[model samples]
Target chain A: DSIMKILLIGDSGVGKSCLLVRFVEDKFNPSFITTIGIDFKIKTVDKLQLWDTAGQERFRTITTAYYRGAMGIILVYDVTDERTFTNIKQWFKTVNEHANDEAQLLLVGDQGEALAKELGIPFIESSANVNEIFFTLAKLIQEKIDS
Target chain B: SMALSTQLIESVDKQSHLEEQLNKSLKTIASQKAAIENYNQLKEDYNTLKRELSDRDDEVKRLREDIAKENELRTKAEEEADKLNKEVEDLTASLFDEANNMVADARKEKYAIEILNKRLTEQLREKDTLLDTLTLQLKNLKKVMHSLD
Candidate 1:
């Protein structure tokens, strides 16, 4: 069967790998490590190939270029880091333009202190503060899949 | 050159004024019709933009609600983390204390062995002195008995 390609893109130190491990593999690591250009992981069930990318300025080119042929893209940002969360809109735009209609897009926000602040914008703010990220992602993924 | 000329000029003047009036009226009506069409078109556009903006607002509202829910979940997760941390701290402390006590007990056992060694050394010295005394007494008694015989 043809595999689904899922990409993970976010800023540095946003716990993207941790969340991925927790959700997909049910594992946890106490320490953190920055991901490289693209950590390619393929899961057989959904036949999903998840490309976990390092989110530094240096790796921006790599992430942007790898957006090709992705069936789904998970946009991740740290709830504690407003700057990373701020980058979500850019990520959202890039993903929408690059991926297919069958492709799913999700916004994964790692909750923290930054989320508690008055984010000042409803569309970009952490859903926890209002409709927050998890449910938003779930709804979005559901819609995309259903569509 | 008087009545006929004056009638022709007056008739031409009247017809020219009438045509001018008709042209002005027609132009105004056409302008008004174009305006109505334009206004309706603008109104349709405004309504569509309004509806789209309204939907975005609803999305904003939904996002806000989601944040509330996530915060609630965070609180629960945090409470559990705190509880577990406390439990781990208590258990670790207890284990450390038990390990220290075992070490103390081992030190005491070592001390007992040293004391026993010292006592044994003193007893050996005393035994040596007694043996010397017994040997002298036997020699002196043997000498006295032989003298009596």
Candidate 2:
């Protein structure tokens, strides 16, 4: 009966929608398309409400407001893209500023590990083409709630 | 002299008869005393039997009270057991409903995944066809450019 709001935020082309689709729908889209506004899917396992926000700067204002309502925030990055990994600091800063104080954060890509360790958050490497990112994040969020 | 001897013999016989009567009386008194002693002994035995019977009755009453108390305890214990059994049944039913809900949720998610997989596969196939066509067109265009050169 309990519901949890989880948001996915990262630079463009980091496969946020792909990851969401994989976890919620168990499918992957090879074709890449930019998210225009915000899209969401529900996972009944934990009654998780997953929000997929647009990575474009134009949609930043709209997406930032969602952070405050989120109980969990996933910071995704493209493992193949060096720039996407480097821009994690900005994303972390935005999360710190906008997200609720009790919001749980997780980094879904690694060097990734060192950055997460420095930020004092949990980290894991994942690909939208494969799996386990959302599952681990959901587990952590459940643990946080239980505690 | 003959008359005097007859009188003396009569006197001796009378005296002996009197002695015999006294002895008989004494023997009768002794027999009566023995009967009285036997009656007293019988009375004492009756009193002891009465006392023992009363004690036995008290023991029976005490035993009956003890049995009643034990029965009360046994009934209370049975009632407590029944209450616990009802609680266990209620918990089992609750767990069963939760398990059913989990199964239903799993089936719904499975159906959703299947639908999405089918759509994604179709989209992938379409993209693959479009890429093949584009690759052919690109090769032909490159050949035409080389001819023009």
Candidate 3:
């Protein structure tokens, strides 16, 4: 069995840390402390090795050097924040250069079914106030890679 | 003889006045006896009333003591009830916290089992592939031997 490395990458203040707490701790934190350089948490679900990265620029460069090995990327963004939403495209483009071509990708902008159809890719409506969105995202990634 | 008869008649008149005085004295004595009987009756009534008042006072004192004792007992009972209620509240909170920890531990155990299951499944698949390869090799070897025979 392979150890699937997953990356949580996106703009700052896009609830990246909040999503991490949800997946790792199984709870929601309305106030998640920001990551200074780069921080990672390991969670082994089946064969998955979850890598929760802080989106701070200081630590962003450190992971960029080895982002090519990441098996999956969750390109997260805040739904209510326009800056975070727009920055998602920039993050995706950067990951494309650093990561492998076969990397599994997911968008987190709107938690609505209509937005998922509109985006033409897998999406989740994630929030700091809501749980289980991370679980759905994990399941979606599993299905994507298994196929 | 006429002078001696006049003296005797005057003495008789004096004796009749003395008898009248004696009759008045007897009447006064009779009135004093009746007044003494009335005084005795009034004294008996007063003594009975005083005893009744004393009995009523004792009964009032006993009733007051009983009421005070009941009030004290009621207060103690209320305090005990309050303490029990507080204890129940505390216990309920403690139980809730303990349940939460148990739930967390169960999730952790489940996650660990899933990891083990995945590893086991991967091992099984690898063994299956190895078996397939060995079977193919055996079949090829048998063909070669049969051709030689």
Q: Which candidate has the top score in TM-score?
A: 2
lDDT of 1: 0.59
Per-candidate DockQ values are 0.01, 0.01, 0.01
Tens-digit lDDT track of model 1 for B100-141:
456557767777898899999998999999999999989999
lDDT leader: 2
Worst 10 residues of 3 chain A by lDDT: A27-36
Q: Give the range where candidate 1 chain A is weakest over 10 consecutive residues by summed lDDT.
A: A26-35
lDDT of 2 at B141: 94
Give Cα-based local distance difference scores for all models: 0.59, 0.70, 0.64
At residue B15, candidate 2 shows an lDDT of: 93
Task: Give the per-residue lDDT of model 2 (tens digit) for B12-119.
Answer: 999999999999998898989979999989999999999999999999999999999999999999998766645642353354346545555777778789899999
For A1-147, candidate 1 gives per-residue lDDT tens digits of 545556767734535454444434422222122534334444445255555665564646545555655655666676667787678666666766655545555555524334323322223433322223333443454455564
How high is the TM-score of chain A in each model?
A: 0.59, 0.80, 0.71
Candidate 2: fraction of native contacts reproduced = 0.00
Q: What is the per-residue lDDT of model 3 for residues B1-149, given as tens digits with 9 covering 90 to 100?
A: 98979889998889898889988998788889979889988999999999999999999999999999999999999999766645652353254346545666776777799889999999899999999999999999999999998
Give residue A59's error in model 2 in angstroms: 2.8
Clashing pairs in 2: none
